[PDB]
Design a protein that fits this description.
It is classed as transcription. Keywords: PanDDA, SGC - Diamond I04-1 fragment screening, bromodomain, epigenetics, XChemExplorer, transcription. With 178 residues, the protein is mainly alpha-helical. The protein folds into 2 domains: 59 residues, Herpes Virus-1 (2-Layer Sandwich), CATH 3.30.40; 119 residues, Bromodomain-like (Histone Acetyltransferase, Chain A), CATH 1.20.920.10. It contains 7 helices and 2 strands. Strands 1-2 form a two-stranded antiparallel ribbon. The longest helix has 19 residues. The protein is globular and about 55 Å long. Bound molecules: zinc ion (3 copies).
Length: 178
């Protein structure tokens, strides 16, 4: 197994996957690494299994259809993995915890949103469709763009949104377009 957490790239108390060489901190893995389960398979392995069981699940899809899917076990897992892929980027630190807004010439957003709030919402099964999860994720970056206006710090939101959107297209097998 790897000697660092796959998500945060630090050593520490790590749990090792039995079917691939990745390792995780307890709360870096999503869902949080399970108490028992020998062997244990990480979320990367579980996602790969879905694809292997149904190769046709990788044919192209329309975003509009994906968003309307109910949050059954497989779509729940896919959103957990997409969330994890965002946390894997170090720039996710800016969007992880609850923000506050006091900047001359800007007003805070009507509906603040952050990664740990989405994490909790997934854990507590508060989304009924894929749409609910994707809307909250996109709202994080949209709030950031709006608040920071012409400050160059707005680019952090563009960067992390791009990581989200690429991973969304990959995980849910969105039809490639020009
Ligand atoms: Zn970690
Ligand atoms: Zn694994
Ligand atoms: Zn199939």
């Amino acid at each position: 197994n790897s000697n660092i957490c796959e998500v945060c790239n630090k050593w520490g108390r790590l749990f090792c996957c039995d079917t691939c060489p990745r390792s995780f901190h307890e709360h870096c893995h999503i869902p949080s690494v399970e108490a028992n389960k020998n062997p244990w398979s990480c979320i990367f392995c579980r996602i790969k299994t879905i694809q292997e069981r149904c190769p046709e699940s990788q044919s192209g899809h329309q975003e509009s259809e994906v968003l309307m899917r109910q949050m059954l076990p497989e779509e729940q897992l896919k959103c957990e993995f997409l969330l994890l892929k965002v946390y894997c980027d170090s720039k996710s630190c800016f969007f992880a915890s609850e923000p506050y807004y006091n900047r001359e010439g800007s007003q805070g957003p009507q509906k603040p949103m952050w990664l740990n709030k989405v994490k909790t919402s997934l854990n507590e099964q508060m989304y009924t469709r894929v749409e609910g999860f994707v809307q909250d994720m996109r709202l994080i970056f949209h709030n950031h763009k709006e608040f920071y206006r012409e400050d160059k710090f707005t680019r952090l939101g563009i960067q992390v949104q791009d990581i989200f959107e690429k991973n969304f297209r990959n995980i849910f097998a969105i039809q490639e377009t020009s």
